[PDB]
Ligand binder design. Structure first.
Ligand SMILES: [Fe+2]
Ligand SMILES: [Fe+2]
Lengths: 370, 370
């Protein structure tokens, strides 16, 4: 395999530089790295590698990876290759992958447009094989730069794997029978499509509203607020799937079921020993929905109520009421009001200033090992 | 089996009340629970069950489990049986166990006296089988009361299991050859004895110093400070093992190696996706010792320096100099100074107000699956 030969060369260079991350912006390091990439038998021949060589050799005066990103953003081929520094994807250093794109609904693509690339990884270097790395953002490159039109990659194969290994088992154990009928037994191609819909709607809605990101990113990085922002856009995508009639009805209901099942179940149990940001917001959704008539609990099993679409709209309306006051109060004041709302429906420990898994999901974590 | 019949009856009652935690202090609930306990053909006739039935039936006028705790604290037998409500042990509701005590070193128990019970669990109800439940504290009972002379149980069989599952393969992968010679191939009884020394010294030193807990507990619940307090007492215990000549030299060196291997390795990788309280403090220790000459990194491997005992003393001395200013500044000012000290040696994200696993241990988590 020619691709495996190229990837073995990247994996070996990755091993050599593993101890030198503090030098990743050092021009003496960058020159040696560029030189080794250039001299690599198979890898050095590739256009994207030549682009990275030029970006690295020029980094002292221009600390950007402009030629690499031009290649990637223009989709000159289906290869990604760069030097990465992403604190939440620690496995990434010098990495290479090849991807395949997925089909997309044309109305979805046109009406909810964003520079999102839902892709399957075909082959990759060691750092991309970590289950942690589910996406790739432009500021993950060492230059730390993101532009509004930079392509953003989501690795749908990893989300299909997660849905099969975790969500499917939580649906069987936690949901009333008939809860997610289109998802029941659906094949990987089907979940693939739903997941690709989810990420396209997800990225689009991050840019909508009164406190979009990245503009208000530094106000939305506290654990409960980062999760709440994730939830804001996924509830938005849920409602689009229910409300936009130009979307194919079968595919839209399937994407609805996927987003809801992921936020109600898989994201709800994330984090040990405390909930992570996604899980705090999902437990907020669970309790809000239970208290406002959107779901019901019958002997530890969740029933989705027929009124759930109206309750989801109410929940999204409530988030938007809080955020709209950015127009008349400080971002700090909106923050405090988003925290207050979150804390009404989650298990907040005021002395630890952190959250505990609400008892409903702590027991499922124990029962299912999730 | 008679104990098996008792615990089966406990587990069935635990199942019946599982959805009723909000009713655990309501007398109508308690009156019915007490009756079902009394009528359990085997459980109801245990003296400990008689005690609990009496406490519950009288909870309306005296909200405490005085008869149960008298039984337990007096070690009338080796059974524990109560109604629990411990937010960090969510699996505990109506629970039962039988334990066995362990050999005890006389000088250790006399010079470092505390009401600590290092025990092995022989049989237990379902809630005590959770890997989370490594200990039982007096305030974990529904009454939420703790007294200084109440017995505190540590389940040593669970620390042995954790040592063999995590620490051992971490020692093999991460430590330079000959780092922990007494622990190599140590049998379970040997680890058990080291672990019992550790918990006794652990509980003792919590009560010592200028900001002991429980007095200053509410200032030491923030994630970095909860970890730092655990670390303060374990480094104190390490140093006692090195410095107290009246302890048997073979057991003391073994306990030293055990406490260090646990704090340097197993505790340093806890928490997903972020480090938990133990792990932040262990990463503080790792980076402190690296920069101050106590350990050295060679080829990704930790070498313990011969100077390490003096660097551990310097580390504990530093913590104590910060805490000593409680005498001339507020508890809040000490808190900031403990946080500033922690953040100098850990990966703190000021916008998330939380920590990331430092890259050394993030890579180990990925590599070994810990
Ligand atoms: Fe997002
Ligand atoms: Fe402790």
């Amino acid at each position: 395999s020619p691709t495996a030969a190229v990837i073995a060369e990247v994996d070996e260079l990755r091993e050599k530089i593993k101890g030198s991350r503090n030098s990743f912006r050092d021009q003496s390091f960058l020159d040696q790295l560029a030189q080794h990439i250039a001299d690599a038998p198979h890898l050095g021949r590739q256009p994207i590698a030549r682009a990275l060589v030029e970006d690295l050799r020029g980094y002292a005066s221009e600390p950007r990876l402009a030629a690499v990103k031009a290649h990637i953003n223009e989709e000159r081929d289906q290869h990604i290759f760069s030097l990465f520094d992403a604190s939440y994807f620690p496995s990434l250093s010098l990495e290479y992958l090849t991807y395949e794109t997925l089909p997309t609904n044309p109305h979805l693509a046109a009406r909810y447009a964003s520079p999102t690339m839902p892709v399957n990884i075909i082959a990759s270097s060691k750092g991309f094989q970590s289950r942690v790395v589910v996406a790739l953002f432009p500021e993950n490159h060492i230059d730390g730069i993101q532009r509004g039109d930079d392509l953003i990659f989501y690795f749908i194969n990893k989300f299909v794997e997660r849905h099969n290994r975790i969500t499917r088992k939580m649906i069987d154990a936690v949901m009333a029978e008939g809860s997610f009928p289109l998802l029941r037994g659906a094949d990987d191609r089907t979940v693939e499509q739903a997941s690709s819909w989810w990420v396209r709607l997800h990225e689009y809605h991050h840019r909508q509203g009164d406190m979009p990101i990245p503009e208000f990113l530094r106000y939305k990085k506290l654990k409960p607020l980062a999760g709440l922002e994730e939830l804001r856009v996924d509830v938005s995508g849920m409602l689009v799937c229910l409300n936009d009639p130009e979307l194919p009805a079968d595919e839209a209901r399937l994407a609805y079921e996927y987003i809801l099942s992921e936020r109600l179940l898989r994201y709800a149990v994330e984090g040990i020993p405390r909930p992570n940001y996604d899980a705090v917001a999902s437990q907020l959704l669970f309790n809000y929905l239970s208290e406002h008539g959107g779901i019901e609990l019958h002997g530890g099993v969740i029933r989705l109520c027929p009124e759930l679409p109206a309750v989801l709209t109410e929940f999204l309306d409530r988030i938007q009421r809080i955020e709209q006051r950015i127009h008349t109060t400080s971002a700090e004041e909106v923050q405090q009001n988003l925290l207050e709302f979150t804390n009404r429906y989650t298990d907040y420990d005021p002395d630890a200033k952190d959250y505990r898994h609400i008892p409903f999901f702590a027991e499922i974590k124990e029962r299912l090992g999730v």
